[model samples]
Target: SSFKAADLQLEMTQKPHKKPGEPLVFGKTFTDHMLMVEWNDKGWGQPRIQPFQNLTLHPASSSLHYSLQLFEGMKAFKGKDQQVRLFRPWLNMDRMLRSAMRLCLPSFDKLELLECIRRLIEVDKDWVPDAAGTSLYVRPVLIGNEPSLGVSQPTRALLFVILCPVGAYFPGGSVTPVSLLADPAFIRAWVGGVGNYKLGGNYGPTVLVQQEALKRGCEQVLWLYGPDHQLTEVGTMNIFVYWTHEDGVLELVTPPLNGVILPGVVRQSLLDMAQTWGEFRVVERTITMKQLLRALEEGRVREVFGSGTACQVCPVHRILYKDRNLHIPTMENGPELILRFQKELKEIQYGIRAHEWMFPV
Candidate 1:
């Protein structure tokens, strides 16, 4: 499973690192080099770090036609100690394997892919931003590259890793709690659907819904499901509800993976940390809109937010339901449990906190 330098034929890009003090935005900018690998019926092949270049794919490529592509978002941070660290990249790789498997794509050894990721980060470490809320966003993508529209499983695939120097999560130094529109018309997942996976096919259908949300002054969408209208997830992120329970106990609620939600890495981390706090019931179950409305009506709703690798968790202050606004609790840019989650996670990612979630480069 070892890939040698000679087998990869790595190419170097002439582009230099971005000038210091530049504004960073997610996915808008890229580094000088990238790690690219191709997979097919043969097996997972050698992975290499090559110059960032244009990707030329045929119009009939399966990825372009049928949307057979998946991507993982994680980060590499240059800490105060000046050492580069990756925050739970293995988690990303692990989920990526499951995603690839679900799509019938060739599997790569996770350890080998992880090692290659480390090497790629090492080669591009200078690109890691050093400001608060600034880090390098690592994007590892796999696409079906087979050039034909046969509608069968693709035998050829292309796996590539790219890096982007990103600035603050919201670009304004803080994120406000956003409102969600619970539209049962747009169900993000069903019992047998691929929404639980990270396939590109899951996202395209919701573009208009997102635009509609933005037109109405909201940041994201809250997908509703079932006869009782249970909450599932937001586009590209998982949803969470914090409220007080029957026993006068605080509870952090997220959707159970009832074959519906995307198993995001950060989502699981937050859930685990909430349970560790021992002050709340970390409940994972089918939470409905009625329950949510009841929580808000009874003043039990504490906070609602979206969890993901992008912002860790973006709080929601209200929901736009049936032409009405339901106000949620106060969650601001201050030090709270959610803030601790963000800071502690960042600390571990930046090599400040020695947590097991970090991988050294």
Candidate 2:
């Protein structure tokens, strides 16, 4: 059966707080309500929206034992016109469905789920922030909850969505460039793994690596794979390198989705946007550390950045690889491409530029 918005049940909070504005941290603060749906032997059940609260799951839930959990990061923006909108939510839904399939979880109509999410957002529309560089962060999670000790397919699952008001990912604005620890010894994803999917299993194992980076005074990890040290991703985001290639041609290159890189929405959008400008060569292929270091030495590396849902375009100023530091040319005067993409994207997101990517709630 299809999910219906009319079947949604709402439970508003009795004591509502003021909408959080500036100084709002990411994922630290949540809205008043959340939406949840379930699946069992009878298939998907009607969705419900209720006051945000903790969940009570079985002690032997599959999600706890087998790591069958998937989640998606999205945001709802309060535009200049006072309209609540979602930025390319369908892409997130598509990715979420793929993650669920990867985990052998039950699938539901993406359109219906998206509509349910829209209804939930409408219910908590007041939580959507109006300040610049802020948004109502949307997190949709699916977990296998079959209460059994057996290692088999889960017969039950739960899908839930929550919202949070968040400020800038990088405090004080996006001016500060992030330093990274590019350790070839630590591999983030391999050729045949769940690197392409946004599963909780993939991220839970990255905490220690991130901690190592932080210990070494790096803000994020520049994940490298294989003996040649091919740059794969930057922390949770997809990586990009803007440099003049050995052929003397200026190129914007990012690791191709060769079953190792996550196909990020922002990454794809920037690639499409750059190609449409026809100012430089937009190439998606592997770039080894040897090649990147040579380009940096020859002063060919123009910019290094990462693109993801959190920080649309995060500049990389320095990378500590093998005890050697390589500095990019994006610190003082940021490269034109990165700034242009960030500006255009924020403009579209804040409703200054009209675009189909923004879906009104």
Candidate 3:
């Protein structure tokens, strides 16, 4: 029922002095070692940190047939003082556990798993990129590897964590806003669906829509839902809107976590920071297309962005919707709030400002 770091096994990879530079795309390069743990009817097997390699799964694995898979994205940063730390990894643990339970997969002790992850990172500390914006991308994946696929709870499973040294989102270490394609015909997730959970099923369908966005000259999809065309998400991130409400109050709003929206780590962190500042009203409410068009016509919508682990906050410069190009003034309006959120979150991540979120590796 539990896995511990104390019983972890080590299979070190030999030969070193290899590193990539310049264009270190996300998830393209991996570290030397990865952590793996197996679960059977008895319980979780001994955790192992072995050389990164291909995983051999059973032909009739539950994950292959029913798509019983879940994953979480996290990062480990190298601070100014050369200290390696992880930002609020416990939240990832919690989300991972919830996602596992959602798929009828077995659960594990969060702290113990964190400890195991810590150990794994400690062993691969050199892989934590030292560049200001570069950091190690942590991908923890859980799959139902039950050999017999019965469309039921997995009798056997495997949990693995892989680290990738991802470069900054921008090519020149500068900020670049993204464009979105919003079409009501394609929905990302729905009410009473598994949208709130980080599962493989939730993502596999988005690639097609993403291609549609690319074809329409947009970088990502501004996923919309419901009859009113409520903005649900931007690409893979949670969406935010900074506007003056009809009542003339400046408010920062995002879609409510009403079972359809993903409760992102960065989204919650930004809400917390915004509320703490008390400079403007922080709200979690749905922002529909009809209301946004009205706000835009009235020149009330100031900035729009998305929140995620990759880029804490991403500004939206334009949205292509309904045969019209909506020129969002996220960059023209000084984008003051979005910039501050990005800066503050980056600072916390790199240990520029002391905060409780940075957990030392």
lDDT of each: 0.80, 0.89, 0.90
Clashing residue pairs, backbone N/CA/C < 3 A, model 2: none
Q: Name the weakest run of 10 consecutive residues (lDDT summed) in model 2.
A: 13-22
lDDT of 3 by residue, 260-303 (tens): 99889889898999999999999999889999889998999999
- For residues 154-199, write the lDDT of model 2, one tens digit per residue: 9999999999888778786566789999998888778889999999
Give all TM-scores, in the order shown.
Answer: 0.93, 0.97, 0.98
Model 2 stretches with alpha carbons more than 4 Å out = none
Candidate 2 positional error at 139, Å = 0.2
How many Å off is the CA of 200 in candidate 1? 0.6
Pairs in clash, predicted candidate 3 = none
Candidate 1 global lDDT: 0.80
For model 1, residues 254-277, the per-residue Cα lDDT tens digits are: 999978899888889998888887
Rank candidates by lDDT, best first. Answer: 3, 2, 1
